[PDB]
Design a protein around this nucleic acid. Structure first.
Ligand code: ZN
Ligand code: ZN
Ligand code: ZN
Ligand code: ZN
Ligand code: ZN
Lengths: 75, 76
DNA sequence: ACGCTATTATCGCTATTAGT
DNA sequence: ACTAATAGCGATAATAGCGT
């Protein structure tokens, strides 16, 4: 009774095919016209990793945004 | 109880309890399982990375709240 | 696009380093 | 010495991928 989460994107895991786990979307989906419906299930061991990947990306965006917002604010 | 050792196996490998070929920028274990954008090697102690992340956290909360406030102001 | 087999990854458990 | 902290193997559970 182990906990294994698919490493293939959920689309072409359903297709029971070979997933080139490319990110954000595997070539296999990109080719069958569904690039952006391609996503990978969350692993328990990539928790911290994934949460910091989000924190990182947000501080970055939030930073460049405060700038633009406050130049706008110049009425 | 004190931890002064900075691991040589990427963090994902530690988490996954496996062997890291310790290559850069990302170990091959991660590349094979497809989670390379998540591979990272500790450059600091756990307690140092923890504090560092805590402060990053606070900046996030204030920046988001500052962005929101500046967003509301913009009604007209 | 799917039954079936091949190949892989989870986690208890064994083993090694080092704090006190 | 005693044991937490750390590293990692390996049997086996469970997913990966083939060919159609
Ligand atoms: Zn795929
Ligand atoms: Zn997309
Ligand atoms: Zn896909
Ligand atoms: Zn690794
Ligand atoms: Zn790695």
């Amino acid at each position: 009774k182990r906990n294994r989460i698919p490493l293939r994107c959920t689309i072409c895991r359903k297709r029971k095919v070979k997933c080139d786990k490319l990110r954000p979307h595997c070539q296999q989906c990109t080719k069958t016209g569904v690039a952006h419906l391609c996503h990978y299930m969350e692993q328990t061991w990539a928790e911290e990793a994934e949460k910091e990947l989000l924190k990182d990306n947000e501080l970055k965006k939030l930073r460049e945004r405060v700038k633009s917002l406050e130049k706008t604010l110049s009425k």
